[PDB]
Symmetry: C7
Subunit: 260 residues, 7 copies
């Protein structure tokens, strides 16, 4: 009779050919649709060829392996090769996917916003736009910096604009023979500007004793937007006011014993 | 007859179609629920689209592969591709998951608490809030620092506020011709403040002999909150008290032989 | 009778031999076609031998393993070995594939264009051509720099030409005894060139007080193409104009106490 | 009849439902027990929610996949996805597990004990407590340092307290015109303290000839607890004793030819 | 009867023994051929023993595992062990395979050719020969440098000989009291050599104002082969021509206030 | 009848219960034995609890999964989870296993022995004991250094005691106006000690011409144990012998043009 | 009857017991042979115990798992655990296997030979012996350096002895007021030694203009063995010959304006 085995193989062959035809058609329509949507978004044509071709050839390889195994053929070696190639392609993508994950994290927890002056990854500047792949900064000189979001979200970020109040300190070296109480009193009667907060009242201390000058440090609290104005005003009035009561700002002193 | 094989295939097809319908419905309800709960928490709408779409497309791919294999089709190639893509996505997530694990570890063993001054990963400041993903610090200038918890928990952390008592040392360079016993006696009769503990009694030693000055080192124990006050008081009274008994603080000496 | 088993094995052997013959033929035609297309593109003949031979031997190993398993032989060990070798080859390719992925990313999001002066990965220069594998720069001395696209797209990039307007600052050290208001007025009446924008009006401030000179800083906005011309014009007119009103640019001062 | 197939499917369905019920119950009791034991140990309630929920959802996903495959459904895609997620979670845990392994190694081989002054990973201090996850140090200033055990056990560790006897060396620069034999004799008749061991008898040598002074080096053996006392005693008596026989400690000499 | 099972096992045993014999013979002939071809190429005999033995033992292990599983034995543990060993060997080969891939990339895209002066990976020199594993350079002192191709193709490469025209700049410090217009006119009437191109006409600018001298910068375009000749000619004629019109090249100035 | 299926399931259940009982008993005896042998070796009791418990729970999980799959249950998800956890534990162990492999390599090829002065990984000292996990060194100050064997065997090691003969060089700066032939003759008639080998006869050369002194270099061969004695003897006799024939060792010269 | 199933299980049990016995015997003989060959080569007995025991226990675990699965037991969990342990052991071996692969590469392509002075990995010296695991160097001071072959073959290597001819350059700073043509003529009439090749005729150029002296550079070609002799001869004759025609080698000049 030999009829049951003939129909048992014929059903397998018919199902394999049906799968082949339907899958080929579906892959063709899908790649055509992807190419159309990529052309509509006005991307460069170099970046469309090996996207359409990539998708088509990958899906066609998968389908051909599947149907070849469906008729009668052993394809364990080809499945192993496909797995190796897929793992290679996956490992060759870790940087970009890490950037996208870091961008998602930056959008979820908000360490900084647009307009903030931040400093991270060895650069600094004002946040101009946050995307999911990178962040854009404008430098102090108004040059554009692009920072990827992966390393950005996996490192430390200093945000200069997050707090409403900041602490301008100061630093000035004075003579060694000056009397320090009078000097810090002079420095304290220099923060009477109507921009220095009184909330944590100002302070004037003697920090380290340097090699040529004694270092005094003023310490005041201002609003986050008055930082640099107050710093520059100090930079000028400091000398102009210390020199009045006989306190100089000295040069690099030296003691020389001359043997002739 | 050929009836048993027909019903044997019909049962498989009916089970596959039931699975397809029920799974499609369940995925739709789940993604709708996830979208609703994400909208209720007021997250940005850019971060809702590719969460809902991501979940839906991943679950739908899995279900379609399962049912296609359930009817008659060989899908080992597609399972290999799915595994490769999943491993790629998993490797593109290691940084964030390491941050979450480090946050769990920081909450379990407590190296620092809110209010502590710590120093780690090249930054320093007062701990303002500990989350599971990052830690927030306020700098000495009151700028906000965000440190990820993975590298934080996998590195060394110095905690300045953990111990109740600290050791203020000091350092002052004096003349080479000064008598060192009298100088360290003077330095010892300068820590009579009612803030220097007597428990490990104060000490005054001659550390290294420098190139222009002999370095003396005071060493006292204070409470952890009086550290900087005592340091600054020393910074002032040191010169003011050494100079009284004829001990100066010298400049960068030099010996010059002039040949004319 | 023993006839069913004989034909059941004969069908397997016939299918295996058919697969072997057809696959061998297909591999031969494919490698011939690849060799022809590689010769037509004028690549070096060293780079054609171990491409054709590589493709042929890999596909032939896969086919031979498949047919050997198709007749009667257990080939799980050889499939494991093939998988190990494929994973090795995939891991030995991560750098180049990362470069191609970074090139795709640079073409998709455009951080820089041809003609822009950029700085990244420790080098700087004018973008001359962007490919998918590397980027080509011309240095300030007109030497050619080749930067791979992977590390380029995974790091920070500073673009000097992206913004239409830039901020030329300045820096000049002046005497300590000079009056700073008059000095910054002089510096302000030096940016009257018809190239300094008035939009964010120019500024002149006292930055840090140095060890030998007080540092003044002018700060003006220009168009992105007038940056260096304005900087050099300042470099000349600065001294020529400060010296007129009795403000010098000092040398490294020193105070020396001579003991004889 | 069709009875055998009906009971063959009914047994499978009954076993699957039994497995589902029993596994659900067991998972519920296990997560309740884990939550109870976590509450009894007084851990923060943020760290209990996503431990109980984590355990429950993971075990429930595994059980549901198992029973769904047990009735009739193909779940190879879901097993692949579960494996990918498990590998991701495992790779996101390598730092903490490395810390626990390093802690086990530090407890097994004992490089240091509590009370020892050690130096490793860029920090130094007295070992205060050794745990399996990290080691705690007290600095010389009495601030607390936390070092993870993985990098600690995988790097070099210097133990200052392991040996019963140490070698205090010394270093002093003397005049160029001094006679070196008399100078090292003077240095040798300065280690007559009853704290310098005679076992490897003391030594005094001429190390490098510097640019302004000739460097002499004493070298003595003391007990590990007398190191710093002997070093400071040398720091004082060195100058006080060299200067007696006409050997000075010179400043930075210079020879200047004046052209007028 | 028990005849069918006896022949069913006898066929398996006969096929396994046939496979064993044929595979052993094939492995022997293959390793003999490989040894012969390795001896004909005159490689060291240390490098032939553990190539022949390696190939033979690996193939024999694979074949023995296959036939042992073919008769009746379960060998899943041995296949797992073979896979682990193969993955170990593959990971212990990543550096060399990366070098070969980088060599292929260097041959495909040509960043440099034989004869070019390049600089990469911390070294510099003239390309002498490009192989697929490494690149050979001759240093400026004529010593041979060998650079592996992997890190070479994955980093930046500066090619000094790719462009037909280069820009010799210059740099010279002049007195502070000199008039800068006359000085840059003098520098401009020094590039009248018939080797300085007029295409981008020469330029002379005032770069930064230094601490002891004002820095002038000439800037000319030459052919890529006249770079160093023009640079050295400038190095001589610069002083010889500036000094003629009363412009000196100053030493490290200093201002010293003497207190006696 | 339904008897064959009942006994076919009863045999499976009986075998599963037998396996469960025997495996549970074997695991109990094995963990008891391991605990006993760990107690006999006097290890800390913290390190015994989570060794016994670890072994027991791992083996019990494996056995329970095996028997649950043996009766009727699908456990592919649990096998995937077990594999993920095992891979995690394996990756969390790479440092210690690398240390043990490096220790095996150090014992196999012997780069150094006990008593040798070596320098590696940023430290230096005398080898005191070599174990399979780490190496112990005594520093020049007699403090104990512990170096892990993995990084030690994977880096460069300098062995100061391996060769029987060493080359003491020297270095001394002399006046610029001295005659160099006479100076190197003086240096050569200073290595007449009966400790300087004549085998590669001594040499005296003029190395670089420094900024203040001309550098002479003696070069002699000694036995490996006389290195430092000869170096110190040179350090003394060098000045004492050069100064006799009118050759000085100069200070940092300077030429100063005074404008008043 | 129930006879067929009884014999079907009895054959499986007999084959499993045969496999167990034969495999146990083979493992015993193999480990005995390995121990004997390890004792004959005179390796330390610490390195024989955990080689014999390692081999025996690994092979015995594999065989026991195989036979336990061969009778009736499900061992997928144990195979997963064995695979995890094997992958762990393989990852804990990457450094040594990379060293062996680098050694094979160094023997295949020969970058250096015995006797060559090379410089790589931060060290330098004469190649004394090349093995497959490491390379041995003798330093300039005759101390022994051991460099692993992996990092050696994966980095740059500078070979000082590969080329037959080298270029000794020179460098000497002369007065600013000297005439440079006469000075380079003097330097050119100093390379008349019968060791300076005339093939690329000698050259004398003015390199950079320094801060205190003008730098002249001689440039000659010698044989690779005369490099240092010619360099030292230049180091002497340079001053002795320049000073004859009134060209000095100056000290660090300075210009000082004295305000009193």
């Amino acid at each position: 009779s030999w009829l049951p085995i003939v129909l048992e193989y014929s059903g397998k062959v018919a199902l394999a050919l049906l799968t082949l035809a339907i899958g080929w058609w579906l892959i063709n329509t899908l790649t055509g649709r992807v190419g159309g949507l990529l052309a509509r978004r006005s991307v460069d044509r170099t970046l469309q060829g090996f996207v359409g071709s990539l998708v088509s050839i990958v899906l066609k390889i998968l389908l051909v392996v599947s149907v070849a195994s469906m008729i009668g053929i052993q394809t364990t070696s080809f499945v192993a090769a496909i797995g190796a190639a897929g793992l290679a392609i996956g490992l060759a993508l870790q940087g970009s996917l890490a950037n996208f994950a870091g961008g998602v994290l930056i959008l979820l927890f908000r360490p900084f916003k647009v307009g903030d002056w931040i400093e991270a990854q060895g650069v600094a500047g004002t946040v101009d736009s946050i995307l999911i792949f990178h962040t854009v900064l404008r430098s102090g000189d108004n040059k554009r910096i692009i920072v990827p979001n992966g390393a950005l979200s996996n490192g430390t970020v200093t945000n200069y604009s997050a707090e409403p109040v900041r602490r301008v300190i100061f630093d000035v070296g004075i003579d060694y023979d000056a009397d320090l109480k009078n000097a810090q009193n002079i420095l304290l009667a220099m923060a009477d500007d109507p921009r220095v907060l009184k909330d944590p009242a100002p302070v004037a201390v003697v920090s380290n004793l340097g090699e040529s000058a004694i270092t005094l440090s003023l310490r005041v609290w201002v609003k986050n937007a008055d930082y640099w104005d107050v710093m520059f005003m100090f930079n000028e009035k400091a000398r102009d006011a210390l020199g009045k009561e006989g306190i100089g700002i000295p040069f690099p002193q030296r003691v020389v014993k001359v043997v002739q």
